[PDB]
Amino acid sequence: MRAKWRKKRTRRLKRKRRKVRARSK
Amino acid sequence: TPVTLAKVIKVLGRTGSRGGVTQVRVEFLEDTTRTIVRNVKGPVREGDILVLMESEREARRLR
């Protein structure tokens, strides 16, 4: 386990958040 | 600036925030054979006589 790729996942789930926002909004 | 001269009967051990004051037991010769220690720094042995200003002073830890 290493939290640096977890920080990548955090950032890219913010990306999915904005993208599903733009589509759905 | 009255000047007085002292010798160390026994060195004690360096201390300070980062090595502040060189503990030099100032037997200021006019009142020799006493254990009053004052503000001194420098290279340290025993046998030298150097200059101290105040005859009488006290002090706690040099925090």
Partner: protein, 98 residues
């Protein structure tokens, strides 16, 4: 891994504690986990007891050992060099030497 059994906290039956702030950086921290310190310290340096004792009327004033409490987030508590690091097989002993 398993470093410090108490998680360096010493609550172990609890699970919330009110926070506590620093005083050198003003950072919060859980109380028990933290490193604060009491100071039963002299009100004045004994580089002054002679002069102060003399020029004081009502001879032999009490000279109060003042108290205080400092609060340090572990940041300041190793930046200002209070707690010194150790090994494992030595960390266990808690009883402070002085």
């Amino acid at each position: 891994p398993k470093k410090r059994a108490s998680n360096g906290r010493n609550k172990k039956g609890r699970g919330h504690v009110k926070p506590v702030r620093c005083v050198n950086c003003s950072r919060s921290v859980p109380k028990d986990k933290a490193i604060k310190r009491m100071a039963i310290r002299n009100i004045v340096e004994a580089a002054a007891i002679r002069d102060l004792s003399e020029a004081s009327v009502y001879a032999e004033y009490a000279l109060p050992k003042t108290y205080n409490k400092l609060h340090y987030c572990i940041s300041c508590a190793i930046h200002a060099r209070i707690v010194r690091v150790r090994s494992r097989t030595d960390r266990r002993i808690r009883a402070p030497p002085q």
